[PDB]
Ligand binder design. Sequence first.
Ligand SMILES: CC(=O)N[C@H]1[C@H]([C@H](O)[C@H](O)CO)OC(C(=O)O)=C[C@@H]1O
Length: 370
Amino acid sequence: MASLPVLQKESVFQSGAHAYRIPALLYLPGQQSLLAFAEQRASKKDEHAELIVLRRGDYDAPTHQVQWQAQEVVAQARLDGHRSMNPCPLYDAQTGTLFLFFIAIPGQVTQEQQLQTRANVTRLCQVTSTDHGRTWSSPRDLTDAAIGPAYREWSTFAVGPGHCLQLNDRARSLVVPAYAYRKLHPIQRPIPSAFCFLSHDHGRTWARGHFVAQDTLECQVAEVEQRVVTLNARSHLRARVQAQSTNDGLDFQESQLVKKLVEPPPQGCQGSVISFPSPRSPAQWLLYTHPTHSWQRADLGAYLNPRPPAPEAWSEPVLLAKGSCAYSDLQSMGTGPDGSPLFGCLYEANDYEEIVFLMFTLKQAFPAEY
Ligand SMILES: CC(=O)N[C@H]1[C@H]([C@H](O)[C@H](O)CO)OC(C(=O)O)=C[C@@H]1O
């Protein structure tokens, strides 16, 4: 009945003068620290979003606990007159550059206004850091270069939220998960589909991967090794949509509903997925966190896939948190104190009144594998 006993459970963000939503977590292996991002909003409503905040956490080996420094606004992550949303961090292990992708929307123009008028006013931006997130560059609007001609083809769009991916391909490509409401029919309402922005030159130039042939919203990607990019997306079909790409994110040749991974009504909820070194035939396994309630957003659970990307290989969930739970973001942190893979998890709880940090090992979550 009680949730999973974990190495650590701590509220890193709480409602106060501002509300906090949309967590994003990034582990910096060489720094042994975590970057927890979130949207600082004037209220819980989406259009009241303002800026992006950040807390740097340091993992202490002797105590196997993470101590978090004070939150601070990522001042550079914004466009004049625009509110910032959807933080999507990424660490380029080859250049050491830290990327923070996000979207910027004029004042309080809602997503609904853009959908109803089929008029896109959302911007794709990024800020980078060469000192691991301590200081950030001026924002760069990627809209023209990354979206260009397709801009008029979408009612609106977003990236993430959550951590991105860097492939172990030749060019060490950067992959940013996203979705867009595409204007396909003259009368029918534009349908959203997930896809990935791609960069083969470490963020210098960008291109758009093709759409998952499914009605999908927020998604995240992971790579498993031949080399496959598995995409896990939110959908209104009461189940998650999972798609695989064997051509590094450009196209998703296969996709389907994973009924075992429930989505609450009426339009599901965002979830997170990551790959990590297998404790044993396949090289990597997958971990996925998401609410497990079928009627509302509650009971955050962790699922395991020991034979990725096989949809039928997803395990039954393990209860991570009881009660109201929503968005989450996962990160593989290496080896835990018990010799098994260590994981960090950031998630919205208690009717969006706090964002909780959870840290646990594979041994704790899935002991049957041991
Ligand atoms: C950019 C934006 O408004 N994102 C919002 C997202 C979006 O409405 C949905 O993915 C369909 O477009 O939904 C939710 C949500 O808690 O369900 C909060 C996000 O802030």
